[PDB]
Design an enzyme around this catalytic site. Structure first.
Site, mmCIF file in Angstrom:
data_model
loop_
_atom_site.group_PDB
_atom_site.id
_atom_site.type_symbol
_atom_site.label_atom_id
_atom_site.label_comp_id
_atom_site.label_asym_id
_atom_site.label_seq_id
_atom_site.Cartn_x
_atom_site.Cartn_y
_atom_site.Cartn_z
ATOM 1 N N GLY A 34 0.788 -1.235 0.000
ATOM 2 C CA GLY A 34 0.000 0.000 0.000
ATOM 3 C C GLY A 34 0.820 1.285 0.000
ATOM 4 C CE1 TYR A 79 -7.963 0.784 2.091
ATOM 5 C CE2 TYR A 79 -7.201 1.860 0.089
ATOM 6 C CZ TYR A 79 -6.976 1.461 1.398
ATOM 7 O OH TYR A 79 -5.791 1.744 2.035
ATOM 8 C CG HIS A 108 -5.185 8.188 8.147
ATOM 9 N ND1 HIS A 108 -6.493 8.228 7.737
ATOM 10 C CD2 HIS A 108 -4.456 7.926 7.040
ATOM 11 C CE1 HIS A 108 -6.557 7.987 6.447
ATOM 12 N NE2 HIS A 108 -5.332 7.819 5.994
ATOM 13 C CD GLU A 145 -1.969 8.545 3.455
ATOM 14 O OE1 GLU A 145 -1.724 7.388 3.050
ATOM 15 O OE2 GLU A 145 -3.063 8.873 3.960
ATOM 16 C CG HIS A 198 -6.964 11.898 4.772
ATOM 17 N ND1 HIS A 198 -5.618 12.169 4.902
ATOM 18 C CD2 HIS A 198 -7.117 10.635 4.316
ATOM 19 C CE1 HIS A 198 -4.994 11.068 4.530
ATOM 20 N NE2 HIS A 198 -5.856 10.117 4.166
ATOM 21 C CB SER A 211 -5.207 4.094 -2.043
ATOM 22 O OG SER A 211 -4.798 5.280 -1.382
HETATM 23 O O1 LIG Z 1 -10.966 5.164 1.009
HETATM 24 C C1 LIG Z 1 -10.247 4.844 1.947
HETATM 25 N N1 LIG Z 1 -10.433 3.690 2.642
HETATM 26 C C2 LIG Z 1 -9.638 3.308 3.665
HETATM 27 N N2 LIG Z 1 -8.612 3.985 4.108
HETATM 28 C C3 LIG Z 1 -8.339 5.189 3.464
HETATM 29 C C4 LIG Z 1 -7.292 6.008 3.850
HETATM 30 N N3 LIG Z 1 -6.979 7.181 3.294
HETATM 31 C C5 LIG Z 1 -7.738 7.587 2.279
HETATM 32 C C6 LIG Z 1 -8.810 6.872 1.791
HETATM 33 C C7 LIG Z 1 -9.114 5.657 2.396
HETATM 34 ZN ZN LIG Z 2 -5.085 8.130 3.914
#
Ligand SMILES: O=c1[nH]cnc2cnccc12
Ligand SMILES: [Zn+2]
Ligand SMILES: [Zn+2]
Length: 350
Positions: free
Chosen positions: A166, A173, A184, A186, A272, A284
């Site tokens: 990831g 997802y 959180h 990154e 976010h 992602s």
């Molecule tokens: O869409 C997301 N699902 C799970 N975790 C995330 C983390 N950061 C951004 C988007 C997602």
């Molecule tokens: Zn994220």
């Protein structure tokens, strides 16, 4: 830098096919516009771009570890316990998503569904087909291919040969109504890219990186036991805080809805959280620019070993900041990060 995007609002970009061909250059451009100040930006790709012909051939794709998302709490403050269930296919997952028990409730506007999510997030826990190793991009797609972004983060795999799932590889997802992600930043306070392949929307909340410490102080006050146990407990991805709670405590934030076919960019130290409107699929990965090096050097990591991602900053410092290498190794690097400053690569646009 303080003059651009002064309210640090989420910005939307519409690149042409020519502008869409150079990923790193386009990120430099959006930063020259003050996009990074919000911590989150939306990118609508050119109409002619498509990462896959159809998604009608992925029903037998296996989600190895789906998570039942149990939420405990009250009054806009929650803890999410992500329970691992047995492996299931995308077809099995879609059937649960669209069932009467788990389907999206009837609503008029986003505000109605948002009120619904914050009223019912502790009831009827949904299943999130989250953190699935894989890609939905066709082999030939060269523009904004999450699988191969070609950013400076590539030094980790090029020099050591090590892959972090990831982080320098893509995650899939599979969402359903009420599935979500906790507040959180990154791993290593890196950037991230999220493409919504198909389905129902994904709503996001963001706190500008220049107000990130205010969110951290709020979280520590509410969870003193968690704050005592770990230096960066928000990295556990278990803390849910409602927009009404943030408003009440004066934390500046913005909100945006991502629709199928759109990219979301998160910036270094951009907190976010968010939720899925119904059955969808998002891809992602993390990436870096020259501006991230200082964020990676200053990132406060999980100290209780619940989160294990740690990248060596040495290779990046030696290669991009050689004049600071000795001072940094000696622990004398007293650089203060200005969150309003764009990446050095943005210079051509300024
Ligand atoms: O869409 C997301 N699902 C799970 N975790 C995330 C983390 N950061 C951004 C988007 C997602
Ligand atoms: Zn994220
Ligand atoms: Zn921890």
């Amino acid at each position: 830098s303080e003059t651009l995007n002064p309210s640090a609002r989420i910005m939307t970009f519409y690149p042409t096919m020519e502008e869409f061909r150079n990923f790193s250059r386009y990120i430099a451009y959006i930063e020259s516009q003050g996009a990074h100040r919000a911590g989150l930006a939306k990118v609508v790709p050119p109409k002619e771009w498509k990462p896959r012909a159809s998604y009608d051939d992925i029903d037998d794709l296996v989600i190895p570890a789906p998570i039942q998302q149990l939420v405990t709490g009250q009054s806009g403050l929650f803890t999410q316990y992500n329970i691992q269930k047995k492996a299931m296919t995308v077809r099995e997952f879609r059937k649960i998503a669209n069932s009467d028990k788990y389907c999206t409730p009837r609503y008029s506007e986003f505000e109605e569904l948002e009120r619904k999510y914050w009223k019912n997030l502790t009831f009827n826990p949904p299943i999130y087909g989250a953190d699935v190793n894989g890609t939905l991009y066709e082999k030939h797609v060269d523009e904004w291919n999450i699988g191969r972004l070609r950013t400076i983060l590539d030094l980790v795999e090029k020099e050591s040969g090590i892959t972090i799932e990831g982080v320098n590889t893509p995650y899939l997802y599979f969402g359903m109504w009420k599935t979500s992600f906790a507040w959180h930043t990154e791993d290593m306070d890196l950037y991230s890219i999220n493409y919504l392949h198909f389905g129902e929307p994904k709503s996001w909340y963001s706190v500008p990186p220049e107000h990130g410490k205010r969110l951290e102080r709020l979280a520590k006050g509410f969870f003193p036991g968690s704050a005592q146990s770990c230096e960066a407990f928000l990295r556990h991805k278990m803390t849910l805080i409602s927009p009404l709670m943030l408003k009440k405590y004066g934390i500046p934030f913005d909100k945006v809805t991502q629709e199928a076919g759109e990219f979301m960019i998160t910036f270094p130290y951009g907190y976010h959280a968010g939720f899925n409107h119904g059955f969808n699929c998002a891809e992602s990965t993390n990436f870096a620019t020259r501006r991230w090096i200082e964020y990676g050097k200053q990132a406060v990591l999980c100290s209780c070993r619940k989160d294990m991602v740690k990248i060596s900053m040495d290779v990046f410092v030696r290669k991009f900041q050689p004049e600071r290498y000795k001072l940094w190794k000696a622990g004398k690097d007293n650089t203060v990060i200005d969150h309003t400053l764009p990446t050095p690569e943005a210079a051509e646009f300024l």
